[PDB]
């Protein structure tokens, strides 16, 4: 069952074996992935998070981010540790009380403390639209049509060297899959469809690192949503999905009744499908209960290319139709050396006092804010352009901005910008050497918004900056509840920190 929009959510430690290998984890709602949190557009969500963690090897503090939800007027509820709050300590709880005006689509939630989400705290978050403009394109859209793609590690996250190329031990599809080494024939996930029906499949990358080449043997996929943004229909036979991205696609159950492989090939870790790694099963009602016998093609003739995507609504692009054609045009210098990433020469290390709390206490320019050199102020009611030229090791890097979606004016592997009708999204691959992936948005949401690579190992190694958007209006726009004001005193007391 789905939970929400008003619900408790307990965060616990437990042993799990999603690929046949037992390890302890950090779980929401007792499962991997966590339960789907759901509501309708414009609803009030009140997710009271109970921190019941006791195993220090995965951290006993926590904080949860609602990925892709704008949090307008509720910056304090966004979740990134030391940007918008101090962590929740064990034995305490915290009500994330916010609203979702003007958004409807496929989202997710995850820990936003250190690399803790890798240890299991990840789940889907769906905001349905009772008047969805795409409603007539499918018959079925429910918890059974969500497809999560996850990397899974046998080593605990706090034992992963910082700045290292860290590699997974299994791909999990809807929580199940097989290990790349010492492979055992542990259970695979089954997605069941009825011949003749059309399904809104909500594809969610909950990855900590790899991107996946996703396909379904015998089937194609008609994309209708990208990171919460409705798209024109685009039919493809393969989707390369980067960490934290989402797509809705229509699956037409129009092939013969039978069993078909679902494939998710990561860019690192096990290559291919031997022993049923990187796999799940699409089963038609009435098919024999047996593994598929289907083949992938040698090459995919209609793969997703990001520049083929266009919004369903006339969203356009803010600013003027040339590079630098914005009120505040930025170019970030994105680098890696010696185990640490940097942005504009500064490696991100979380501050002792969360950025939002520094601003509420009166610090009002970005040079007064800590960490020094890690906070860039943005002016209010302005068009922002951010060029993100690739080349830093460990690519391709999927960059994500909190508090906003953005027009993708230039995409990976294509030097031509699009100032007319590019897709809008919230997480974007910045591509490869020589690319100049560029995003635009307008500043109508006061508060500190994190910008970072969504490969969680890279964020931990410093690949982040904070956009302090409209510092002067942050306090008036974001009144804070007493329980939020209580978090840093409680956290610092528990950890013997002076502030
Ligand atoms: C990606 O696109 C951005 C623009 O969105 C390019 O930024 C431009 O970068 C050049 C240098 O590479 C800048 O010109 C330089 O400016 C300094 C003065 O600030 C001057 O001393 C240098 O001699 C040179 O003129 C320019 O200001 C900047 N913005 C623009 C043109 O709008 C960036 O180069 C692109 N990166 C890649 C890898 O393609
Ligand atoms: C590389 O990225 C560029 C920019 O996003 C892509 O260029 C765009 O290509 C589309 C599709 O061909 C062009 O739209 C076409 O326009 C004609 C004339 O209106 C229309 O009849 C077609 O039905 C279609 O709408 C679009 O104008 C063009 N934009 C720009 C700025 O060049 C390009 O396709 C990408 N390259 C690859 C290999 O995908
Ligand atoms: Cu996220
Ligand atoms: Cu986010
Ligand atoms: Cu990265
Ligand atoms: Cu984030
Ligand atoms: Na425009």
UniProtKB/TrEMBL annotation:
Annotated GO biological process: lignin catabolic process
Keyword field: Copper, Disulfide bond, Glycoprotein, Lignin degradation, Metal-binding, Oxidoreductase, Repeat, Secreted, Signal
Cystines in this chain: 86-488, 118-208
Cellular-component GO terms for this entry: extracellular region
Domain Plastocyanin-like: 11-131, 144-287, 349-470
Protein name: laccase
PANTHER family: LACCASE, MULTI-COPPER OXIDASE
Compartments (UniProt record): Secreted
GO MF annotation list: copper ion binding; hydroquinone:oxygen oxidoreductase activity
EC number: 1.10.3.2
TM ranges: none
Cofactor(s) it depends on: Cu cation
């Amino acid at each position: 069952a789905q939970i929400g929009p008003v619900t408790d959510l307990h965060i616990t430690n437990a042993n799990i074996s999603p690929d046949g290998f037992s390890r302890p984890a950090v779980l929401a709602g007792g499962t991997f992935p966590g339960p789907t949190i759901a509501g309708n557009t414009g609803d009030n969500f009140q997710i009271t998070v109970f921190n019941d963690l006791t195993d220090p090897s995965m951290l006993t503090d926590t904080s949860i981010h609602w990925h892709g939800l704008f949090q307008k007027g509720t910056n304090w509820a966004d979740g990134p540790a030391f940007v918008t709050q101090c962590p929740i300590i064990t034995g305490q709880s915290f009500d994330y009380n916010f609203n979702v005006p003007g958004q409807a689509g496929t989202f997710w939630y995850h820990s936003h403390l250190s690399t803790q989400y890798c240890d299991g705290l990840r789940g889907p978050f769906v905001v349905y639209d009772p008047n969805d403009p795409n409603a007539s394109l499918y018959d079925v859209d429910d918890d059974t049509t969500i497809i999560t793609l996850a990397d899974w590690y046998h080593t605990l996250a706090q034992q992963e060297p910082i700045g290292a190329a860290i590699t997974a031990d299994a791909t999990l599809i809807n929580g199940l899959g097989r290990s790349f080494t010492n492979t055992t024939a542990s259970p695979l996930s089954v997605i069941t469809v009825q011949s003749g029906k059309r399904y809104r499949m909500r594809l969610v990358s909950i990855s900590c690192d790899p991107n996946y080449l996703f396909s379904i043997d015998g089937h194609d996929m008609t994309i209708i949503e990208v990171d919460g943004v409705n798209s024109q229909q685009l039919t493809v036979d393969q989707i390369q999905i980067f960490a934290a991205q989402r797509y809705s696609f229509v699956l037409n159950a129009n092939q013969p009744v039978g069993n078909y492989w679902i494939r998710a090939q990561p860019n690192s870790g096990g290559q291919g499908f031997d022993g049923g790694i990187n796999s799940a099963i699409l089963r038609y009602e009435g098919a024999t209960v047996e593994d598929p016998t289907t083949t992938a093609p040698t090459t995919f003739s209609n793969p997703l290319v990001e520049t083929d995507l266009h919004p369903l609504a006339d969203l356009g692009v803010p600013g003027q139709p040339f590079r630098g054609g914005a009120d505040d045009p930025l170019v970030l210098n994105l680098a890696f050396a010696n185990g640490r990433f940097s942005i504009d020469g500064v490696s991100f290390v979380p501050p002792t006092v969360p950025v939002l709390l520094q601003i509420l206490s009166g610090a009002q320019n970005a040079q007064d804010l800590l960490p020094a050199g890690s906070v860039i102020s943005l002016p209010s009611n302005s068009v922002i352009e951010v060029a993100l030229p690739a080349g830093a090791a460990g690519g391709p890097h999927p960059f994500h901005l909190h508090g906003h979606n953005f027009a993708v004016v230039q995409s990976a592997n294509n030097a031509t910008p699009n100032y007319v009708n590019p897709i809008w999204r919230d997480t974007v691959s910045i591509g490869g050497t020589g690319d100049n992936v560029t995003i635009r948005f307008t500043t109508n949401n006061p508060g500190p918004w994190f910008l970072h690579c969504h490969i969680d190992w890279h964020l931990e190694a410093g690949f982040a900056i904070v956009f302090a958007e409209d510092i002067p209006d942050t306090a008036s726009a974001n009144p804070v509840p007493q329980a939020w004001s209580d978090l840093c005193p409680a956290y610092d007391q528990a950890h013997n920190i002076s502030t």
